[PDB]
RNA sequence: AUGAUGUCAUACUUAUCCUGUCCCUUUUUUUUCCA
């Protein structure tokens, strides 16, 4: 369900909280699964602060729900990898 | 690949030298011996050595891993 | 800029591990030192093969699957095949007729038979070694048929009890010139069942 | 000279054309030889580079790095080129772009750290008296950046010499603009200089010049905002002439004095703030009729600041300010401007939260019944926000009935698609709670009257109101009324419009969720045969709401519908899985799991095994997902012999479906599937040994999800057994299968451990082939990035070679 | 046509100066 | 910018162009890009002064970017076609009259006017078939063309035929060698080129719906105009391959 | 899938093997 | 902001607390040289670490601050440091709020083999031992009670040795608690040979003469 | 003996996604003719 392009930031996560839209709600932010969503998503930057306020960290809809890492990704601890909010390049 | 992964410790390719990989492995081993509390205690209580002297020896061995390069 | 195979044989302790093209590497001594350990694996030979990995079989057919013993003891295959053959003999008119009016009884045998097949009748399979490399073959070389040891068919058809009829000839010839490292127990090296030597 | 300029051009082309390591080396060489080349050609090559418009963002960032390193390595060597750097970076100091303004502030900080603040003060001393407004504002921005770079008292005696002097009012205006910009830039850093800034600005605060007095009041307001909440005794020097200036100043000076009074009012003493609020509220009542839009916005901001200011009581405010506020500011002209309407709504919500929302509700109940649609929607949104803030406890029953009649009139004249007033309707009625039980039947009768409309959207909005109000209807548990409305909606179920049908279906979803189980009329066996041809509709919202209602029914009520009808519903859902919405397919999977929990897992698994091999199209991954849910909710030990026998079908897609359902099921169950690893071993081995590499890709997904699932349970021997096929299968070509190989390798390195992965990678990274060695090196680099912790312990023993010491004596030094 | 011959006019303009009307960027009430 | 009048103010005796007296000065980046464009043109020396060709391209009042039409004329001829093109692309009002309603009739006439190789050849066919058509209003009515602006374009064509002895360029033509005509067009249009992206401005391109090549987005296209209305639009495009693009201004061109 | 033993040719569709009827060249090569 | 380069590598560093607690400086330790300097116009006061009077240890082991603790009063702060021998040397601060001038490092008490030492107030001084007993000490004197010599940073020398500060008596403070730690437990021998309710486990541990076998029996 | 290689159709992958665009104004040099 992923793409070879569209890297997000690869920048270390801070206090700006991730946020999911309805069009891709419930999926994981990394492997897009639905099994035990464990860890809150932090998006490291002005990915939340400013123009993209309350927006999707995935495709681009109106962000309504807190984005979660799943327990399968936090088994290898992919939650510390950084910002998953997509910046188009 | 990724730019941050290239900036991360452990980036290597087929063009990476064996001596450079061994130097990076020795630097990572010195960093792991500095970080581990049990391994540093085992390295310090082996002889009549101080903890600050062992830390200075580890800081010297970090540069000594790149000390005699190719 | 590089040494030959005889110089690599003199320099390294494992001259058989020195490959033909590994001496053309940037660090052939480091490659030989890495390959000299007992916990190393080779490169799969598709890098040397023009044919791709598991693609060029192209003229054979294989059986699809063999079920494990607990699954065959539960026996889902018989009424599954009966249902599949009944569906094949059904027309498509009968197919949406049975769609709009369904019927009972798919299998409905029990639950604890399948539960015991999964747990109590569970058998661990023969998992191979850490250093196994699979290729186009890698499922057929099971003879290592020991050298100096006969087979079960040779024990049965020639009347050899667990005494071969060629045992005196093998002991008179001693070690054979084909396999000088072969051991023939009972005639040459004084051995249970088919494998009567090593 | 010429050779130095040629070397400067060579380093510039190496920075702008070579590799970024070569650019960093050229920047290091420029920082080394800045004293050799001089700041002359350095400035004469940097100012064309700063003036180049087509430079890249990375190019100007590297230019900022080079200028910072050259300034650190040269310091006062660019002292004659202070004026050239100032005239280059004065557009950069007044840059409208935020990143360019930050880079200009960093360049100004570098220039202040290198050359010195005295040269910049001598440069800006003739520019302090700039009568031109744009030139004076550029000088104000540059002097604010210089004051932030060099601190307050580096230029505070110079500012006290300039601003207190009466040389020109333009110089005074520019200096007070410098003071206000520096206070806005500093914020909390102007707190120790609060009395100094008050003494500096007290001379211009009573100036006869209107612009100088206006910028002095603006700087006083900016200082009161910046030093919040310190410097109250510093700002109390101009406390007494502020009340006199509220009566003396007119126009823009009056607005600046009112803004300074509103900024100094929450930092004052409570008796003093009460006396000043009582003094200035009479002027603010006269300031309610300000015809200017910016002046009215400033007055409304002052009203919001006075509402946020404590110590001004509540009864005095509600008696004095609020009926002129509703007379003047609550008007259609203020509501038409959307910034003014939003500011008016926020100020009214803040005032209602400060002094009770009952007064605002009683003053806006008629404006909710006003005939203007956008004005009434803004009023109803304000009443909804006030009810969400305070509550309905302060609302009397007659005022609540009047508000109910007003919002029912608003729903009558709700011409637009205004769901915000529907949400406000639900908010006010939910805040009423159990008090709407007298209000229930006339509201229900009017909604049923609107449900007889010619217009589809009117009945659609009425059904949406039913969906919003089902919960608050069942709060008092009006079971007979809820059953009667369920029977009426059961009659309404034959609607020919899809949006109306979806709204009706969502209303029924809410009603079934709020009634209780044994208390709806008609019951579940009297409803699901009616619901059965509804699922044959082709509209997406109807399908989504009907599948959600079937999910709630098959979740709760399995005890009314025969399993024949349940698998007929499954037969319908097999055709319904080809819908475009992944949420619809996911809820279809959920209904399949509910029906498998209800009726038993045999016939539904036989049906899905028939369907999955028969689909073979751009679907059926959801069929594998549904098969995984049927297994996982209902004990996959039963399901696994049937799926294992269905793997033996040679039909070229059923094996891919078996493996996809296996991967999804292992990901769903996690650690409970440790006993089935021996069962899934030979099928995964045969799929990895299969000639069709899509089967090997999906088996790699199986291995990845199993390594995700049962890590820490002794399955590493079977994981290594499957990895004995996976690691030979690293010769893949397609991106999908090589991503599956990478994910399975990451999962196996997580599962078994880093030592076996290092034993695999170290024997392949030294390959003579560049591509194979680079691929194994990338795999090893990914494994080391994942497992850099235990890699030192898992590193093999290597002796010290002739290059450096490699046999580590730290391992030998063991206590 | 060469590389440094296209920058002597920019060097002369940098030595002369920059006028506020020469590229008047409209910006007011900045914060 | 000042791309039409920098050449004229240079040829009317002013070398201190940015030091020249005015009410307000122009932006210096416009002057710098005009001078660097003139460096990429064959109009300025290394000292930034007009040549004989730089004076002769100011004899005629068209833009220098459209005077490299004339400078590529008589290089390998095709002069008449590109001189007609340089006349008709100097129009003020836009070509083609597509009103409210009708639509499909004007579209079908315009599609009949379409030729591959950009809309310059399309409107060149418009002017070519308007020649030997009596120069009638009935032609432009039935072909949905404004009969006010392209009459001024044939007047510009008459004037530029008259103003040819001062630059000493004949009215040669290659007689249907329109790929060589496009070679001269590309010899003119080297600064305004693009690969779905402009290679100089680094902007993602968008093709106008009124262009003749709105469909079939190419690997290499030049353009004439950079007007943003809703998107970063490409106005008056032409198909290229960046072969003879590398021939003209090689100092401007590097790394494909 | 369909296998042509006269060519050792894979076929995903039956029409691929039906059109595979070069086939006679490799058939005559295997006949030798 | 600041970058002070040192040719000698910094094994450890102790920072003087700025403001009213003293200068805003740091003392980088080396072999018999604690360079105290501040970020600004301050002198690099190289306080020599006071060696023992006729020390029997070889001079290859340079005296460096293995454990350092700044025990601060209401105004000033003393610095207790342990050398390569590990003796507790209390150091004053005669900086006089201008530059680092004098740090009167006098060996106030002889200290045992301690991995770390932290000296709080109200009679609290916890010295964690690498081998042996970790010592919690209560203050008796003012901390400057040194029976050994004083090596100040402003005290001149011949640039070859320091003040010959031999092993002094513990006059500044008294170790009120000595909690014995089994680490580093090298050898072990657990048996029920002794008459006890549980078996005696003898863990042989410690370094050199500061080494013992602790036999523990429970019940 | 299995490689290179052509846009040839069919297959499959991706819980891939169900799809967007027509400009306000505006000025720019020079030469012959029959009873
Ligand atoms: Zn995940
Ligand atoms: Zn989304
Ligand atoms: Zn980010």
Author numbering:
A (entry chain D): 3 to 91
B (entry chain B): 10 to 16, 18 to 80
C (entry chain E): 458 to 601, 604 to 621, 629 to 656, 682 to 689
D (entry chain C): 490 to 1304
E (entry chain G): 160 to 190
F (entry chain N): 759 to 953, 959 to 1019
G (entry chain I): 53 to 73, 77 to 87
H (entry chain A): 223 to 441
From the paper:
A crucial event of the splicing pathway is the catalytic activation, which takes place at the transition between the activated Bact and the branching-competent B* spliceosomes. Here we show that catalytic activation occurs in two ATP-dependent stages driven by two helicases: PRP2 and Aquarius. Here the inactivation of Aquarius leads to the stalling of a spliceosome intermediate—the BAQR complex—found halfway through the catalytic activation process. The cryogenic electron microscopy structure of BAQR reveals how PRP2 and Aquarius remodel Bact and BAQR, respectively.
After identifying the IBC as a complex that delivers Aquarius to the spliceosome, we reconstituted the BAQR spliceosome on MINX pre-mRNA in HeLa nuclear extracts supplemented with IBC carrying the dominant-negative Aquarius mutant K829A (IBC(K829A)). We reconstructed a cryo-EM map of the BAQR core complex at about 2.9 Å resolution. Focused 3D classification allowed us to resolve the peripheral regions of the complex and model in the BRR2 helicase, the PRP19 and IBC complexes, and the 3′ module of the U2 snRNP. The position of Aquarius was primarily the same in Bact complexes and BAQR complexes, but notably different in C complexes, which indicates that inactivated Aquarius prevents the conversion of BAQR-to-C complexes. By contrast, PRP2 occupied different locations in Bact and BAQR. This result indicates that BAQR is an intermediate spliceosome stalled after the translocation of PRP2 but before the action of Aquarius. Aquarius binds the intron at position −40 to −33 upstream of BS-A in C complexes. Despite the moderate resolution around Aquarius (around 6.2 Å), a comparison between BAQR and C complexes showed a repositioning of the helicase, which suggests how it might operate. Arrested between the action of the two helicases, the BAQR structure revealed how PRP2 operates at the Bact-to-BAQR transition and implicates Aquarius as the helicase that promotes the conversion of BAQR to B*. Finally, Aquarius enables the dissociation of PRP2, plus the SF3A and SF3B complexes, which promotes the relocation of the branch duplex for catalysis.
